[PDB]
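Objective 1.3, modelling of assemblies. Example input:
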Amino acid sequence: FGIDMNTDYTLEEVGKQFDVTRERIRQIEAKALRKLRHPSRSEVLRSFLDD
Amino acid sequence: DPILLRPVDDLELTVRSANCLKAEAIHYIGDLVQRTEVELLKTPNLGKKSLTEIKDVLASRGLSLGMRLENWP
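Predicted structure (tokens):
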């Protein structure tokens, strides 16, 4: 995403920085996204969604 | 304590310990603080570094092994 940088690189472009063929980059995105799915990891952000 | 019926990834633990806990079918929090050190150990592919995992993961909120609670649920 574009967090304090004005892109939003794509899966290969982030994998271009680290020479990874966008598959482990997609997994390590999905690993960290699943890492932020947990209670007492999403106790402030779940309240930030309009519910 | 009202939270204690939460499944496996409440504690952010490793696929070693999580694999062993879903093999033990231990997911809720009232059941994992029931049994003590060697009582937690005797299931396969778990050892003392996963014991340090269990120790730090229950010292991250301050409950210990010995809460053998009943009428649950």
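The helical segments of chain B are 15-23, 29-32, 37-41, 48-58.
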